[PDB]
Amino acid sequence: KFRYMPFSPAGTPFGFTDRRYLTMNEVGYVSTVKNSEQYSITVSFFDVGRFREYHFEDLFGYDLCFLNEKGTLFGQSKTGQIQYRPHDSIHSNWTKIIPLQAGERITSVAATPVRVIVGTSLGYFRSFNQFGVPFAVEKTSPIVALTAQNYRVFSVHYSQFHGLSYSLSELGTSSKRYYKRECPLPMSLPNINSDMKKDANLDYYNFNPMGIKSLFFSSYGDPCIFGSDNTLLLLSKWRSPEESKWLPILDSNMEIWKMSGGKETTDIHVWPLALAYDTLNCILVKGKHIWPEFPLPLPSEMEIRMPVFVKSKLLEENKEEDKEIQIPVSMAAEEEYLRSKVLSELLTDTLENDGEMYGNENEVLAALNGAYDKALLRLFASACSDQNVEKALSLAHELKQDRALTAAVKISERAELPSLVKKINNIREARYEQQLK
């Protein structure tokens, strides 16, 4: 029967070996190797120019680990012992033991420059400062995963009876605020399928029966997660009470299928690291073992894309075949207009609440608006070529620039749709009247 288990972001199992990765992210990766009755832990960084790679020997069996730009946090799920190591020498390494009950274990941990957090199988939440000064204790469902950004914390929980749920909260300097509290979480579940009893699959679900691979905040501070079906999921509209919703923004299986030439290359897997604008940082793993191997392979990147795609239509349109399959202009324009609209809205929310975090987003936003109207103009011209006046007129309403409507008028004239020309001219006049208000 079911058993709760510990988790660290993007760490691997051992496999048939004496070594594994404990956690991996945009800052670095933590790896360990068995040496007799001890283990050697190495902290490696993707910027060892800022940071320094270092290593030590583990006599405690820290089965949990978390890395940030200030230091590394280590934990033991059974004994309750924890340890924090700043990367600097300005501040000291320190340890503490958490008061676990009989039958309790720590499931995950997290650390930010202002806080340290611990969660357990029996649903106990405990919080401390970066020196170990305690602040509070709270009770939830059994906690199964954790991640944080400055004051924002994103938590996942599971019960046999309440099901799967998540919480989003901020440890504000005035008070702790819940944005969502144990609301249901929509991820796909693998284990019911008998196909998961393949050797490489079975090891992962023994290592991690949840099937999650990692979870993190976006480059704009929005929750993201990568689940058992290898789809990247992002929580949209989380700043809006009546609009917060989960969006499937990238199917890595579809991208592998296309990029392999429309082919079922299940020998390829993706290990997620972090999200930067429209592009995910990840490792492309090859072979039977679905987790990355030793020594660590190199970082890769992939773009988010909307799920418009149909295999049969793309094969027919496409018909050296390993090269990525052709996409029609209609599909490309549709996918672009959806992606441009999504990106513009997410970025708008960022600038309205978080501001320009990087100092160039107004430029990206202007480019996105141009791409949006241009994609709609392609779809508009297609509707006009089909001589569908109503569909073309409805598409004309979606265009933003009056310059776009001028282009639409000229397209309508060449499509020999004078009724559409008249109606678009009425729209242009109405918009100009509205602009004169």
Binding site: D373, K374, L377, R378, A381, R403, A407, I411
Partner: peptide
């Protein structure tokens, strides 16, 4: 027709 989208590009 693409030339009009070229105008919208220019």
């Amino acid at each position: 027709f693409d030339d009009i989208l070229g105008e919208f590009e220019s």
